[PDB]
Every structure is written in structure tokens, then in C-alpha cells.
Design a protein around this nucleic acid. Structure first.
Ligand SMILES: [Zn+2]
Lengths: 206, 97, 76, 227, 179, 147, 293, 42, 35, 90, 55
RNA sequence: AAAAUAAAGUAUGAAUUAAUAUCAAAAUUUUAAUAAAAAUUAAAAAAUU
RNA sequence: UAUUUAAUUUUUAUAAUUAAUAAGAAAGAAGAAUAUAAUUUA
């Protein structure tokens, strides 16, 4: 009905707006973002720092289904910026762990960020909205090219800091538990198999 | 009671009223040192204010209390004060009969 | 080679500078006591290059300070 | 052990840290001369696990001083090598600390270590000194000239006067360093340390005295300049 | 030294390399072709031998010992592989763990219960180790060129495996002679 | 046994300043609060000052925890709370003759006047409590369950 | 004893079936082996059975005797009426626990004079933080429960990131629970304490005073669902403040934890009724307690 | 020797020696009437 | 065992629950039923 | 590097790839416009009597992904009052 | 010791992390804004500016 | 088994020992007497205590 | 001292698809040390 306590005022810039709590609060407190793609791309470019990159991705991977086709094109365009075809696609490396004989390489929080982007895309374009890739080829090619830009099918070079010593971080697991966290991440699996099977109509009937 | 944080809840009051009968001989004229959270330092500063009595600590105006706990610095003063506030009426009752 | 000097790690995360954020320094200071000295509001564990403020981090009961862009001299 | 002097030296968190010594008796002896010195002279440059101990113990001494009780006087009197410093402890600290209840002693870790061993140096102080009678304006950034002279006073505070019974004691203590048998003790000490041999100790014929009369007639001069 | 002391290990998180994806002086993948070996009815050990020699690279005229160049063999239908007579029941598989109790004596039937694929892998291991033991890279590198699929379903349609047409010249059944 | 000298508060008034400035300012608060509730002088009984805590970690909802302007019911979709409004609290007690409805009515009128008093900070008793005399915060307590 | 009865796969055939054996033709189920449509692939010495008066009369008797005596044969109804998915299958259902904190130690009496030493655990904020099904393989699903909400500046910069991606408020601690697909609850679900019935037995994983320990039998004593405590009759070797991972002990020596005699759990998650408000509710009236041991 | 998800059924895995650790075969060793003997006549 | 779930401890947050209050509450419940 | 962990070193990623090849089935049974979870038949013979003449039972449990997808997506209804307000008898 | 160790055994000890952390490790520092000396954060000097505000 | 003492430390800096190749881990039999000698299968990463 | 075992390589959000019976920015004190993550403090 009414406030239980007083609310101290703030001006227009410093309010916490841009998000919304889930429909049923007292049971589920999940936070869903309402932010437009323009200001998320803006947050991605204007504050180049790692945490704002992750912060942009966590919002635009929450909202994938809730935007149109071209709105996705500007997204993948904005996201494909720090990637060179020649260079290793996904390697973001922070800590050198010299603990063992041969130095270990640990990535930062950007890696699972991009991967979570790809998996959200997987849930949107394959499972709950299978028609969308077939409808517009534009984002078919955009998604395919972004998916080729980070190299999703050789994750081993996500973890490789020196190309003379290729790192097997992705392809290796031992039963005592090494690489449970870096283990086999089906990443581009469902997407690529699906968008191959969109082109798999070999039938002359249609 | 003793270890309560912040505000003193009513349940906590119930505790004190329970321990009223725990000790058979008690009068509102009893010395300060029987109170919860009255230490050495807390007793002394009450004494120089000419307060010997549970009645007298129940007679405080609450702006004597705060400068007892802030300007002077007997801490946990509102605990003992409130402890008086609760217990002075029942004591009078038990004193009559 | 260019020289082997390290650039500033003073603003990064450090696990032994991390413990002093929530530690109680009342006796260390005679005149100048500050609310929480090592604690940088909005930044992960006192580190200035780790800025989280005015991002989407959902923290229902704790405060967050708004974003003002950090200067050049504060980082390095 | 909850009693605010008597010490518990363990490593568990309920106990204040034991600093290395020969026996707990020895720990007590050490602690006693540390506290005595700190009460005499507000700062101690103290290495190791000793300094936090000094912090806690100084807080205990100020607590006893605030007690202002004959039992407190007596129990502090058991603890110190100096009887006189006990009197100082009950004259000074209450007025000094009347506005503070908690953490009376400031510990400051120094970035320099003993050359002798790796142990770190801590600078332990009493807190606010502008309320103190004899320590009012003193500067500890650097030491005094010869260590029997009263320490540095801040330029803006020069004209401060101190309790007479304290500078009486201080002058009586300092007056045995101007007699020549101290000079003989000084040279003979050079000889001794040189024999036990310790490097960088000059030969006793190079050791020209700490105290001369010209230096005294300038030191007393500037001392009445501070007065 | 030449070969380093700090070495890539199984417990080390870097992990163990796959020689198919490795690029090294002695690894040549340029001139390889893919084979399809249907194991229906053929004896396990024989199949192991043939596969071992296509895999190792010995079927080529230009084969050189230090240069590892193999053909990828897709061995299909491991489940139908035939071991003669009582042998399924009588042929041991022995290994020794270094710890108190150094004997595991395990029947072919048990290995077949756990994985059929491990049997073919075992005999491939043997037939490759028959000529290469003394160097690890020469033992391990060929074996990854076997693709062991225990029925007729395999991912490899895209390599167009050519059916490897082979009849065993040996008339008699396989014979277990191991001291 | 009936419940003894426990008193249900009217409002709890916060201040960003620490406890030692406010003891000087106590008597000037009651003169203002009396004309907030439009009652005559001496009607309101102010409780003891409570300095809550200096929290490095800020445990929320705690007995000594500094209150914050932002509230969950007040802003639901905000992902965090506005920073600390009040470091010291003092309770407001009325006469005992006011029953539970009356007390809450004088509690509500207060939040009404004080909220706007803070929003005038964008002669009358509100900003007199806000501007030249400090109070940054106010609340209605929860009725305690413990009887 | 500690083995079940041994039945070989060869031994399951028409002559061993408790109920009538049924053959599958794929559009229809019949009691006659499928006669192959190509007659020339009929093997010699094989009788293709189009009718059998021996095996059809027993089926005839059986079915009727079922509909005619429904009260005697209710167990037989298990054959024709399988439980659908969800609906708390007793043998197939594994739900998640929650993350506690060792708060303090206490003492209680039961109905008789008996001194118990209770250890009191606290459940500060339990929310389902994450779902992980690993590559869609069956029986591989995990639900991640977080606890103890924590300020933005606490965790290392890679932990906070995770929490931001999830959408869940930042937690001090997360623990995974392997569970069956039916036992899921959505991300961000506030978990209450009466998710654990006061009668049950609980599996406990915590840190010893310095490796991890697991206690697999421990019964619940008492529940404060106001202050979100739970009481347990044990003295742990554990530091006060240690995060303790809870689970249901899913079988005790041949007996299932949840059964009609013993009882039934509130299955995927507990949910509180809409009409209760804990801010109106005292501590003592908020109490739950076990039957006497 | 059980790890991962364990079902409340009292002893399911006890006859293969208490574990779940392979389970990915469709093919096992067989007497007559056992599994892969689908395709043979008896 | 060095993991995060095990090493991290909740001591600092213990003010969020009133330990001393609940102990006394169950004292009340001790004398109410008469143990 | 024993026999077996090298074996799994090589082959577990291959098992994963193979079951990926199993998952593409549903995928072209998706792409062409069909939507079906490929059904598993119910088995009426789960009750048996062994050679020592005692009752042996087999448990078949079928997971429904359209139920699961609904299970994770929305809350369960309110817990019935027979559950928590009465204890579990030991 | 039962035998002379060659240069390799002598060189084996330097691959270890204990050795590297002890001996070849660079210290992080800045300039004391009051004293202009190189300084490790958390260690201060005896100077009356540097005791109250310890920079 | 509580109590007192002593072990990461900065500095100094010996002694027993030393045929060795970056090493030699596990098992089996054989060979003129333990056999770190053979052969075969195998499965021993680095540092520190 | 060599092998051999046991522990450790200093918070890993997470653990186990197999072997055998697991690792994100760094060192002073892990404590500002008298068991509160500041008991108001000049
Ligand atoms: Zn300085």
C-alpha cells in the first residue's frame, strides 16, 4: 500500500533502472534485463574494460529471443571487433601458473562470457525458435561468420599462449579430476549441426 | 537480555520478568550492581549522579541515559535502563505482599 | 629486448591485499579515521581496474555507488 | 586471564601472541621492561610478535589508569620496574584518554627491518598527545641529539612547560652521563665489543666523548630556548 | 639436455596431446587415404594385424621407420568379431598394477562385457608394440589412427572410406602362445 | 502476566550524523516534532540516541545496521539499494493514551511530510528538521511478535 | 542379504513371466511370436502359432478375474498402469538439498529425561543458482544452490562475473546437487527450510578440523523456519561458521527414505503458502519437531 | 565405489560389483536368449 | 582439500541471526513443558 | 600411462562425437518441420520369477523432456499442508 | 649423499616454485607521496606525516 | 597425552659421501651364490617436507 | 642420501563420462591479534 520507510532522493543519472524483477518475486528473485541493444553495444564499446564487456554480454545473452533479426546483426557486428582471422579466436589469458614444471595458462572471465553468448544463441535459434534462421539468410551468414571468427571447433587454441606448444586443455580429462571446468564444452555443436541440416535437404521433392 | 544486539524485543522482557522470581529476595531499593550489563564502570558513573537505586535508574529521562552512554561513555546503558523500566512495577507489587 | 619492468599491478587484484579490505584498523590511525579505508565502493576487492559499478550485478540488499569514469592517473 | 593486566601468551585467537623467549617467566620480564619503557617514553620501536603484545598491554595500562583505584594502583605497581612511572601513569592517561573508550595505543609497521635479522619493526605509540601534560608537543620523526637530551619539539609548539617532578627525574638521570667515569665506561665498552669482535667499532683512542662542556653550554641554551 | 626433464604429464592440466591434430617433423598427413574394415566374422587377432599395418604405414612401398605416416582405418562391427573355440572363455588378459597386489588376470569375456572396443584396442596395442616399444611417440602415435566402432554406424561418411577387401591366408584358427 | 513498560514507537527518526552532534540538538527536535503531529508541547517522548554500527561489510537487516534510502517495496526493479541514509536512530513515543490506530496514523502523517521535506531539497517544521537541523531518514517500525 | 535376487537374461522368457508374457509387433501387442510376412523365411521345425488355446485361456481367465475382483488385484494394476513422469516416483526421484552454516551448539531434552547435544545449522539464503545438464546424457543433471548473499566487492572478479551472467543475486557459496529431471526447480527459487522434514535422515558433507567429511545417517531433530535454523543431534568436528552441504540420505540398508509407511517429501522444492507472512510470526509458534527416538 | 547420481532403489548395481562405471555398451557377452542373440535362430 | 566451498567461512555474517535470542527462546520452551 | 586411461584419453571424445552423430537424427527430424520426441515403447514384461523361485522386478523409468522443459520453466504449486505440519515417523 | 650430483641435478632445483618465489622475484612498489622513496604498500616510515595518514 | 623449548627464516658456512649416462619406478622367469645382470610385459612428470 | 610411500605447492563458484586404492593475478600476522569483521572513540 504505502512505504514502510522513507526513500532518499537521487537525480536522473544515478537511478538503477534498466532491469526488471521476475513476475513472481517472493518465490523467484531472478533479474531480467530490459536494456536496448543500442546501449548494450554502447556499453561494449565505450567502456572497453573487461568487466563491462562481460556485463554487456550477460545482458545481451539474457535477451537473445526478445529481439529481431537486424538487431542481432548489429550485435554480432559489435561483438566481432576484437577478433583477427589470423589471430587465435577466443584466447583471453590473464594468469600464468608456473606451479607445475611446464607453465599453465589461465583465461579470464571473458571466455565463459562469449561461450555463454553462443549457448544462449543455441537455445534461441535451434530449440525454441527453429524457424528464424530459415526465414532470413542475413543472420544465417552473420551467425556463421561470427562462429567462424572465434574458432569454436578448435577450443584448444583458446588456451594456447604459444603456438609451438599447442595446449590440450579442451580435449583432455582425467578421472582424478583435471579439467572438469575446461572439459568438453559442446559449444558450436547443436548450432552447426542444425544449420548444416537446414542445407541438408538433398531430396529432389523439395 | 545480556547478549541482545540493538533494540530490545518484548520477548527479551519476558526473560527478565521470569528471572524476577528466580531470586527470592529483591527490592526496588536494591543496589545497582544487580542488573544485567552493569559493569564496574557503569555502576560508578551512576553513583556520582547520586543514583543507588533500581527506582532511581527507572527515574531516568533518557537524555541522561544517552549522555551517560555517549558524552561520558558507559556503554550498554540503554540495556540496564530498559531493564529497570521493565522490572520496577512488578517489584513494587511483590513488595506490597 | 625492451626492459623487463612491470607496469602497475597496484590497481589489480592481489590475494594478500585482498584480506585487508574487511580488516579492522581502528588502532592504526590516530587523527584521521575513515569509514572503510581499503574498501573501494563498487570495485572488486579494492582494485580499481575491476570496476563493477553501474553494471548489471544484482545485489538486492547491499548498496552500489553510481559510475563516474576513472581518471588516467588513478590507474597508470 | 580476563583481568585487564594478566597475560595469556598463546597462538590461539583468544590469546595474545607469544613472542619468542626462553621461558614464560622471561616473556613476562621482557613484557614488563617494554611496558615500563613505553610508559616512560611514549613510543617503542619494537620488532616481531612483541609489538602487538605491547599494543594490548598498553591498552591494559590505560584501562588500569582509568580505573583510578587503589587496587589498580597496586596491581600496576606489581607490574613495573619503575614505581615513579606508575605515578606518571595515573597522572597523565586519564585526562589524555577521557574522551576515548577503546584502542588507546597506535601500532605502525615500519618499512625498515633490523639488519641483524629479518624481523620487522613496529612503531608503537600512545594516541592523542595534545592532551598529555609532559608529551604535549614532541616530535618523534627523528631522535634527539645525544639521547639524554629532551626530545625534539615541533617548531610551532616550542614554548611548552612540563610537570616539574618529571624533568627533575629526567635531569637527575641525565646528570650521570656528564661525569667522566661514564666516558671511561664508553671507551671500555668500545674495548669490550671490539674484543668480542664486532665490526665497525672504532679503537678506543678514536672514540671522542658524547658530552663536552661546549656542547653542554649550547644544549642548555637551546633547552631554555624550549623551556 | 635435449629431451627436457619438465615433461607433459597425465596429472598436469595441459593434458596429453592427440597425434592426429599435432604438427611435428615426423608426422605426415598429406598423402593418407581412409580405409573401411568390416570385422564381421573375421578373427580378432588377424584384424588387429591388418589394421596395425595399415595404421602403422607399413603397407606403403616408401614406408620409413622414423617417419610415421599411416592410413586411417575405420574398423566397423567389433561386436561380431569371432574368436575361435574356447578362446573367448580361456584367453587371459594380464596386467600388473604397481602397488601391493600386482595381478589382474581378466578373461576376454569380461573385457568384452565392459567394452568390445577395448579388445580390438588391446590387440592393436600388441601388434603395434611388436615392432615398436622403445620409443613412446612411435608406440602411441599410430594407434590414434584406428577408429573403433562396434557396429555399422560411423561419423566418417565424409571421408569416403574405401572398403578394405582382405581375406586371411591363414587357414587355421588363431593360437594363443604367450609365455 | 500483562506486558510491562515496553512502549510501541510512533516513528523512528534517523540521522546521517553521528550521535555526539545530535545530543546538543535533541531539545530542538521535540519542538519540531510536536508541530509535525500538530500536538501540543511535551506530547512526544524521544527515546535514547542509538549509534548503530560502522559496518565495513554491511550485513543487511541486522540490529545495528545503517539504514538505506532505497527500499525493496519502494523500488522493486532496482538491482541494488541506494547508499546509507542514516547512521543514528532515535525513537518517537507518543502518549500512552493513543491506541494502535492513532499511533500508526501519526506515524504515517510523518512519512508523508518528511518524504516531501527531502524532496524540497531538490519556515514550516519539515525542512527545519531536514535543512539546518539534520535528519535524513524516517521509518515506521514493525510490530514486534514476541507477546 | 545385501544382494538382491539374481535373474539372468536368458531366464526371462514366456515360461518365467509372473504376468502373461507379451510379444511386441510394434503397432500391437500380442501373446504370439510375430509370424514373418515372407513365408519362405520360415525356419524348419518351427510352428507359426496363429492361435493357442493353452496360453489364451489363462489370459482370458486373468483379465476377467482382474476386472471382476478389482479389490484383490490392486497390485496387478501396476502391470497395466505405470506411473507417469514426475509425480514423485519413489525409486526414481532424487531431489536437491541446500547449503547450511554451522551456527552454534545447543542442548535439548526429549519427552523423557535425556540430554541431547544439538548442533544448530543456519540457512541464510538458498537459491537455485544454476542448471547443468551435461551434454544431455541421462541421469547427468545438476542443480546448483547458492547461499549467503554477499556484497558486490567480495569475490574475485571472475566469480562476480558468473553471478552476473546467471541473474541470481551474488552468493558467498555455491554447491551442486545431482538430481533427476523431474526434481528441477527454476533458476532463482528461494528455498525454505521445511524442504527438510524433521523425521528424515540427512547426508552431510563438510570440512573437518583439515579435509572433507561425510556423515550419511544423521536424523533431523528440530526446525526453526522463522530464523531458518535446523537442529541436529550430533557433535561435529568442525569450525563454527563452516559451510555444510546437505542432502537426503536416499536409502538406509534396503529401505527407501521416502515410502508410504515412513512418509513423503515436498518434492522438487518446498513452496510456502501465499497467505503466510513471517514478519507477523513469533519464534515459538514457528517451531517444528521430530517424533521421539 | 558409487559416484555421481545414485538412485534410491536399494541395490541395483550390486551384482556387477557395486558400480555404474561403463554402461555405454549396447553389446554384451551372451548365452542363448541373451541380448545380441536377437538375430540368431533357436 | 583446498576448494572454495570448504575454505570460505561464514563467521563474519553471524550478526544476521540472533544466536543469543534463540537459545533463550528455547530456554522458555524448556520451562514451558517443564524439563 | 597405462593401457586403459590412454584408451579413454583417445576414445571418450570419440564417444562424444558419435553420440553427437546420434543427436543430428532429431535435427533433420526438426529441420523438415516435424516435431517429435522419438518415443520409447513401454515394456509389459518387467515381472519375473527366477530359478530359485522368488519374485524379481525390473525398473524401467522413462524421462519425458516436454515435462522436464515445463518443470524447469515454472514453479510447482503450493506444498500441501499434510506434508510439513506433520512429521515423518521414524 | 651416496653420489656426486651432475650439473643437471644441481639445475633441477631451480625449476621449483619454492626457489623462484624465494630468490628470483620482483617486488611491487610505488613512490611514497610524502617521502618520495620507493615503497611497498603496507609498510611505513618513522615520520610524523606517515604515522597518522600512512600513505 | 596438556605445560616450558626447538623447525619457512636475512647472515655466516663446515663434515661423512661421490665410477657413472637427464635415470633406474612395477612384475615375471632365467643366468656359476641378494641380483639395480639379462629378456619380456609394462607404466615411473616437477618441486618441497 | 637414492627408491618408496604420506603430505604440501598457500579460497578450485563447480567436481568425477575412465585410472588407482587438481588448482585466477600473492606474501608481512591466518589475528591489527586482549576470539564482535570496526562496540561510540581527538
Ligand atoms: Zn613516508
Amino acid at each position: 500500500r504505502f512505504p514502510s520507510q522513507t526513500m532518499s532522493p537521487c537525480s536522473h543519472e544515478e537511478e538503477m533502472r534498466g532491469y526488471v524483477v521476475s513476475r513472481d518475486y517472493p518465490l523467484i528473485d531472478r533479474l531480467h534485463c530490459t536494456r536496448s541493444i543500442e546501449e548494450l553495444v554502447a556499453q561494449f564499446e565505450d567502456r572497453p574494460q573487461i568487466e563491462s564487456r562481460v556485463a554487456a554480454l550477460a545482458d545481451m545473452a539474457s535477451t537473445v529471443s526478445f529481439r529481431s533479426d537486424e538487431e542481432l546483426l548489429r550485435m554480432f557486428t559489435a561483438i566481432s571487433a576484437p577478433f583477427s582471422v589470423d589471430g587465435r579466436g577466443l584466447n583471453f589469458l590473464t594468469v600464468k601458473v608456473s606451479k607445475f614444471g611446464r607453465p599453465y595458462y589461465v583465461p579470464n572471465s571473458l571466455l565463459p562470457a562469449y561461450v555463454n553468448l553462443v549457448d544462449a544463441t543455441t537455445i534461441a535459434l535451434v530449440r525454441e525458435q527453429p524457424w528464424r534462421l530459415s526465414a532470413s539468410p542475413a543472420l544465417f551468414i552473420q551467425v556463421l561468420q561470427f562462429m567462424a571468427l572465434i574458432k569454436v571447433f578448435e577450443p584448444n587454441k583458446w588456451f594456447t599462449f604459444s603456438d609451438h606448444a599447442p595446449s590440450n586443455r579442451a580435449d583432455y580429462r582425467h578421472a582424478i579430476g583435471v579439467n572438469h571446468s575446461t572439459a568438453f564444452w559442446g559449444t558450436g555443436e547443436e548450432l552447426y549441426d542444425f544449420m548444416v541440416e537446414l542445407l541438408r535437404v538433398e531430396d529432389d521433392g523439395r | 537480555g545480556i547478549a541482545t544486539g540493538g533494540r530490545v524485543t518484548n520477548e527479551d522482557r519476558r526473560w527478565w520478568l521470569v528471572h524476577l522470581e528466580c531470586a527470592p529476595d529483591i527490592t526496588p531499593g536494591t543496589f545497582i550492581a544487580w542488573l544485567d550489563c552493569c559493569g564496574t564502570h557503569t555502576c560508578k558513573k551512576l553513583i556520582e549522579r547520586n543514583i543507588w537505586t533500581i527506582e532511581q535508574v527507572a527515574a531516568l529521562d533518557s537524555d541522561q541515559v544517552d549522555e551517560l552512554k555517549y558524552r561520558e561513555g558507559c556503554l550498554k546503558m540503554d540495556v540496564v535502563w530498559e531493564h529497570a523500566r521493565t522490572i520496577i512495577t512488578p517489584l513494587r507489587q511483590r513488595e506490597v505482599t | 629486448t625492451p626492459v623487463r619492468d612491470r607496469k602497475c599491478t597496484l590497481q589489480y587484484y592481489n590475494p594478500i591485499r585482498a584480506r585487508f579490505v574487511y580488516r579492522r584498523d581502528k588502532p592504526l590511525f590516530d587523527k584521521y579515521h575513515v569509514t572503510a579505508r581499503n574498501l573501494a565502493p563498487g570495485f572488486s576487492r579494492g582494485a580499481l581496474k575491476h570496476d563493477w559499478r553501474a553494471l548489471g550485478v544484482y545485489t538486492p540488499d547491499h548498496p552500489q555507488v553510481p559510475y563516474h569514469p576513472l581518471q588516467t592517473w588513478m590507474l597508470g | 586471564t580476563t583481568e585487564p593486566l594478566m597475560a595469556d601468551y598463546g597462538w590461539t585467537r583468544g590469546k595474545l601472541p607469544k613472542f619468542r623467549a626462553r621461558s614464560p617467566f622471561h616473556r613476562q620480564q621482557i613484557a614488563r621492561r617494554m611496558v615500563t619503557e613505553m610508559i616512560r617514553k611514549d613510543y617503542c620501536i619494537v620488532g616481531g610478535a612483541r609489538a602487538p603484545a605491547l599494543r594490548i598491554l598498553a591498552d591494559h595500562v590505560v584501562e588500569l589508569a582509568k580505573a583510578g583505584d587503589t587496587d589498580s594502583r597496586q596491581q600496576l605497581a606489581y607490574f613495573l620496574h619503575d614505581p615513579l612511572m606508575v605515578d606518571k601513569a595515573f597522572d597523565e592517561y586519564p585526562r589524555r584518554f577521557k574522551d576515548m573508550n577503546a584502542k588507546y595505543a597506535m601500532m605502525t609497521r615500519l618499512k625498515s627491518r633490523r639488519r641483524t635479522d629479518a624481523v620487522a619493526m613496529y612503531f608503537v605509540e600512545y594516541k592523542n598527545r595534545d592532551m598529555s601534560d609532559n608529551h604535549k608537543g614532541e616530535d618523534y620523526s627523528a631522535g634527539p641529539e645525544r639521547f639524554f637530551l629532551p626530545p625534539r619539539i615541533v617548531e610551532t609548539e616550542k614554548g611548552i612547560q612540563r610537570p616539574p617532578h618529571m624533568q627533575m627525574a629526567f635531569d637527575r638521570w641525565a646528570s650521570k652521563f656528564k661525569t667522566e667515569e661514564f666516558h671511561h665506561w664508553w671507551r671500555l665498552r668500545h674495548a669490550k665489543l671490539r674484543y668480542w669482535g664486532v665490526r665497525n667499532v672504532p679503537h678506543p683512542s678514536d672514540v671522542d666523548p658524547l658530552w663536552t662542556e661546549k656542547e653542554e653550554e649550547e644544549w642548555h641554551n637551546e633547552m631554555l630556548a624550549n623551556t | 639436455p635435449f629431451k627436457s626433464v619438465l615433461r607433459r604429464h597425465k596429472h598436469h592440466p595441459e593434458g596429453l596431446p592427440l597425434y592426429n591434430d599435432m604438427s611435428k617433423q615426423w608426422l605426415c598427413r598429406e598423402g593418407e587415404r581412409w580405409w573401411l574394415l568390416d570385422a564381421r566374422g573375421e578373427q580378432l587377432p588377424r584384424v588387429a594385424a591388418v589394421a596395425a599395418q595399415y595404421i602403422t604405414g607399413q603397407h606403403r612401398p616408401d614406408f620409413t621407420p622414423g617417419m610415421i605416416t599411416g592410413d586411417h582405418v575405420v574398423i566397423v562391427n567389433i561386436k561380431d568379431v569371432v574368436m575361435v573355440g574356447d578362446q573367448w572363455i580361456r584367453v587371459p588378459i594380464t596386467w600388473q598394477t604397481a602397488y601391493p597386489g600386482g595381478k589382474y588376470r581378466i578373461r576376454l569375456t569380461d573385457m568384452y562385457e565392459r567394452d568390445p572396443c577395448m579388445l580390438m584396442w588391446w590387440f592393436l596395442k600388441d601388434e603395434v608394440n611388436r615392432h615398436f616399444v622403445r620409443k613412446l611417440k612411435t608406440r602411441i602415435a599410430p594407434l590414434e589412427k584406428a577408429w573403433l566402432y562396434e557396429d555399422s554406424i560411423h561419423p566418417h561418411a565424409d571421408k569416403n572410406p574405401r572398403p578394405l577387401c582382405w581375406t586371411d591366408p591363414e587357414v587355421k584358427g588363431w593360437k594363443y602362445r604367450d609365455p | 502476566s500483562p506486558l510491562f513498560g515496553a512502549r510501541v514507537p510512533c516513528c523512528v527518526v534517523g540521522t546521517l550524523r553521528t550521535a555526539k552532534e545530535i545530543i546538543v540538538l535533541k531539545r530542538d527536535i521535540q519542538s519540531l516534532l510536536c508541530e509535525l503531529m500538530e500536538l501540543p508541547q511535551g506530547s512526544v517522548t524521544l527515546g535514547p540516541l542509538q549509534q548503530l554500527r560502522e559496518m565495513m561489510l554491511y550485513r543487511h537487516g541486522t540490529p545495528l545496521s545503517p539504514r538505506l534510502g532505497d527500499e525493496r517495496q519502494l523500488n522493486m526493479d532496482a538491482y541494488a539499494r541506494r547508499p546509507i541514509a542514516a547512521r543514528t536512530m532515535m525513537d518517537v513515543f507518543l502518549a500512552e493514551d493513543m491506541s494502535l490506530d492513532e499511533i500508526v496514523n501519526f506515524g504515517r502523517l510523518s512519512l508523508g511530510k518528511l518524504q516531501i521535506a527531502l524532496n524540497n531539497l531538490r519556515v514550516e517544521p519539515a525542512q527545519l528538521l531536514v535543512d539546518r537541523m539534520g535528519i535524513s531518514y524516517c521509518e515506521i517500525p514493525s510490530l514486534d511478535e514476541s507477546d | 542379504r545385501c544382494y538382491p535376487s539374481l535373474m539372468r537374461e536368458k531366464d526371462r522368457d514366456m515360461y518365467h513371466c509372473y504376468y502373461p508374457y507379451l510379444f511386441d509387433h510394434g503397432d500391437k501387442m500380442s501373446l504370439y511370436p510375430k509370424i514373418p510376412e515372407n513365408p519362405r523365411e520360415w525356419q524348419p521345425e518351427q510352428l507359426q502359432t496363429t492361435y493357442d488355446a493353452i496360453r489364451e485361456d489363462k489370459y482370458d481367465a486373468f483379465i476377467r478375474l482382474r476386472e471382476k475382483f478389482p479389490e484383490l488385484y490392486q497390485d496387478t494394476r501396476a502391470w497395466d498402469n505405470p506411473p507417469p513422469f514426475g509425480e514423485f516416483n519413489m525409486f526414481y526421484s532424487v531431489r536437491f538439498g541446500m547449503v547450511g552454516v554451522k551456527a552454534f551448539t545447543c542442548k535439548d531434552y526429549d519427552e523423557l529425561g535425556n540430554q541431547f547435544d544439538c548442533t544448530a545449522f543456519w540457512f541464510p539464503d538458498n537459491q537455485v543458482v544454476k542448471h547443468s545438464t551435461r551434454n544431455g546424457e541421462v541421469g547427468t543433471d545438476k542443480v546448483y544452490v547458492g547461499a549467503m548473499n554477499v556484497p558486490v566487492e567480495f569475490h574475485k572478479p571472475h566469480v562476480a562475473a558468473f553471478y552476473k551472467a546467471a541473474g541470481v543475486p551474488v552468493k558467498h557459496v555455491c554447491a551442486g546437487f545431482p538430481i533427476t529431471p523431474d526434481a528441477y526447480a527454476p533458476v532463482g527459487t528461494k528455498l525454505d527450510v521445511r524442504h527438510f522434514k524433521p523425521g528424515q535422515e540427512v547426508t552431510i558433507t563438510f570440512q573437518n578440523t583439515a579435509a572433507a567429511e561425510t556423515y550419511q545417517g544423521v536424523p533431523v531433530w528440530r526446525i526453526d523456519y522463522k530464523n531458518s535454523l535446523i537442529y541436529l543431534p550430533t557433535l561435529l568436528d568442525a569450525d563454527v561458521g563452516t559451510y555444510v552441504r546437505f542432502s537426503d540420505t536416499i536409502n538406509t540398508k534396503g529401505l527407501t527414505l521416502w515410502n508410504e509407511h515412513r512418509g513423503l517429501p515436498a518434492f522438487p522444492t518446498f513452496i510456502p503458502p501465499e497467505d503466510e507472512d513471517l514478519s507477523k510470526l513469533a519464534t515459538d509458534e514457528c517451531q517444528l519437531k521430530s517424533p521421539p527416538l | 565405489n558409487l559416484k555421481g547420481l545414485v538412485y534410491p532403489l536399494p541395490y541395483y548395481a550390486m551384482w556387477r560389483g557395486n558400480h555404474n562405471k561403463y554402461t555405454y555398451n549396447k553389446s554384451t557377452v551372451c548365452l542363448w536368449g541373451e541380448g545380441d542373440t536377437r538375430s540368431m535362430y533357436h | 582439500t583446498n576448494r572454495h566451498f570448504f575454505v570460505a567461512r561464514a563467521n563474519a555474517f553471524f550478526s544476521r541471526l540472533p544466536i543469543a535470542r534463540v537459545q533463550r527462546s528455547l530456554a522458555m520452551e524448556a520451562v514451558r513443558e517443564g524439563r | 600411462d597405462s593401457f586403459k586411461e590412454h584408451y579413454h584419453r583417445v576414445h571418450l571424445p570419440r564417444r562424444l562425437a558419435l553420440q553427437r552423430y546420434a543427436r543430428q537424427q532429431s535435427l533433420r527430424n526438426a529441420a523438415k518441420g516435424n516435431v517429435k520426441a522419438e518415443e520409447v515403447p513401454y515394456k509389459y514384461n518387467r515381472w519375473w520369477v527366477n530359478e530359485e523361485h522368488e519374485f524379481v522386478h525390473q525398473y524401467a523409468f522413462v524421462e519425458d523432456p516436454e515435462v522436464t522443459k515445463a518443470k524447469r520453466e515454472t514453479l510447482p504449486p503450493v506444498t500441501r499442508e499434510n506434508i510439513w505440519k506433520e512429521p515423518q515417523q521414524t | 649423499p651416496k653420489r656426486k650430483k651432475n650439473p643437471m641435478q644441481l639445475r633441477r632445483k631451480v625449476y621449483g616454485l619454492h626457489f623462484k618465489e624465494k630468490y628470483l622475484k620482483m617486488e611491487e612498489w610505488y613512490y611514497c607521496p610524502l617521502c618520495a622513496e620507493p615503497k611497498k604498500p603496507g609498510e611505513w616510515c618513522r615520520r610524523e606525516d606517515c604515522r597518522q595518514i600512512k600513505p
